[PDB]
C-alpha cells in the first residue's frame, strides 16, 4: 500500500508509527510540515488534528488507533486477544500519564513548575508501578516484544529529556529501553530519524 | 468465564463495558464500590485505576483496553481493518475531550468553572466534527453499529447532564444517540441500570 504519515517535525504523537513501521519493513513517506502549512492542512481534516495517514488515499487520523491498526495480524500487536487487551492497557497507561504534561502551556514558569510537579511525584509512582508489572520478565507483554515496549521507550525518551535520572533507580526499566533500542530496525530508525528535543 | 466488573456506583468509565456486555448477552457481576472503600482497593491493584475487570484470576485495567478485548471478533467490532481503525479513532476522540475535564478536582470553584470551559467553548466544535463527519450516513462506521455508537451515546449522555442545549442544533447526532438507545439490548439495559447522575 501506498502509505503517507503527515506530522510536526518532531517525534511527539507520530513517532510510535514510525517505530512500527520500521519494525515491520513496510515503506511510507515521512511528510513532515511547518508551522506555516499547518493553517491550510488542519481545514482539509474532518477533525483538524494531525498526525493522520493516508492509505492509498483514503486518511485514518488517531495515532493509537493507526498504530493498532499497522500491528493487526502482526506479532506486535500481542500473541492472545488477552495478551492484546495487556498491550492496550499498558500503552493507556503510558499515554494517560504523557496527557497530564501542559506541552502547550505558554506562562515558561507554569510549565517549569507543573513540570517539576509531575515528574517529582507522579512519574516516580507511574515508574514504580510500570517496574513491577514487568518484574524481572523479558518484554512487558508475553514473551516476544510488542508495540507496548516501543510506546514505554518513546515516552521514556521524552521524559528523560526533562528529568534525566527519572530511571537511576530503575535499572530493569533502563534494560527494557536498551533491548527496544537494540532491535536492528529500531537501532537503524532512531540513527536515521531527524534530531528534535521532542 | 466469570465477569467481575468493578467501579464507582456511576455509569463514568465503566458504562462502555456494560453496554458491551448487555449487547453480547454476557452475565456479570456489576459490582459498585463506595468511595470510602476506594483507597484499600487501590493500593492492591498494579496501576491504581478503576473500572476493572476480573477474569478468571486476572485482573484488566483501562475501560477502551477492556472494550476492544470484549468487541474483538463480535458485529460491534468494525467489518473491516479499516473500519476498525475508524471505530477506535471516533472513540479516542470522543475519549480524548472526556478526559479534559477535572472529574476529580477538590476545588467546587476550579471545577465548575472548566466545566463551563469546556462545554462553552470546547464541546461544540466536537459536535460540528461529529455531526460532518457522520453526514447522512446511519451509523458513525460503516453500515451497522459499533461500539463507537455507544459510546457517543454514552459520552453524549454526560455531556448533556451539563449542556442540554448541546445538540439542539444538530438533529443527525440527536438521531444517532435514538438508534442506539432503540437497540433491544441497550433498551433493557437503560431502563434497568442504577441511575446516577454521572
Ligand atoms: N490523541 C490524538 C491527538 C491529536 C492531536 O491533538 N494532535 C495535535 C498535535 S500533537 C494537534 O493536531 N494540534 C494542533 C491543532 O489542534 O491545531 C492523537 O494521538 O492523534
Ligand atoms: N483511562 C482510564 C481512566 C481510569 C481512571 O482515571 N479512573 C478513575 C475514575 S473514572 C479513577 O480510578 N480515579 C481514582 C483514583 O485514581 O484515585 C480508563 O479508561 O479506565
Ligand atoms: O471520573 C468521573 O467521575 C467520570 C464521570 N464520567 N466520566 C467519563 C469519562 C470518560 C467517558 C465517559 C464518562 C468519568
Not at 518513546?154 to 533500542?181: A, E, G, Y
Request: a negative charge; glycine letters at 4%.
Amino acid at each position: 500500500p501506498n502509505y503517507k504519515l503527515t506530522y510536526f517535525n518532531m517525534r511527539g504523537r507520530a513517532e510510535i508509527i514510525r517505530y512500527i513501521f520500521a519494525y515491520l519493513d513496510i515503506q511510507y513517506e515521512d511528510h513532515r510540515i511547518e508551522q506555516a502549512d499547518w493553517p491550510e492542512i488542519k481545514s482539509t481534516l474532518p477533525f483538524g488534528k494531525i498526525p493522520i495517514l493516508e492509505v492509498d488515499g483514503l486518511t485514518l487520523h488517531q495515532s493509537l488507533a493507526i498504530a493498532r491498526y499497522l500491528t493487526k495480524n502482526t506479532d506486535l500487536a500481542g500473541n492472545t486477544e488477552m495478551e492484546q487487551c495487556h498491550v492496550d492497557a499498558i500503552v493507556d497507561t503510558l499515554d494517560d500519564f504523557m496527557s497530564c504534561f501542559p506541552w502547550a502551556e505558554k506562562k515558561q514558569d507554569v510549565k517549569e513548575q507543573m513540570f517539576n510537579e509531575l515528574l517529582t511525584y507522579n512519574a516516580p509512582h507511574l515508574m514504580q508501578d510500570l517496574d513491577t508489572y514487568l518484574g524481572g520478565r523479558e518484554w512487558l507483554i508475553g514473551n516476544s516484544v510488542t508495540w507496548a515496549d516501543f510506546y514505554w521507550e518513546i515516552c521514556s525518551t521524552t521524559l528523560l529529556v526533562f528529568k534525566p535520572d527519572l530511571l537511576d533507580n530503575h535499572p530493569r526499566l533502563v534494560t527494557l529501553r536498551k533491548k527496544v533500542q537494540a532491535i536492528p530496525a529500531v537501532a537503524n530508525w532512531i540513527k536515521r530519524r531527524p534530531q528534535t528535543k521532542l
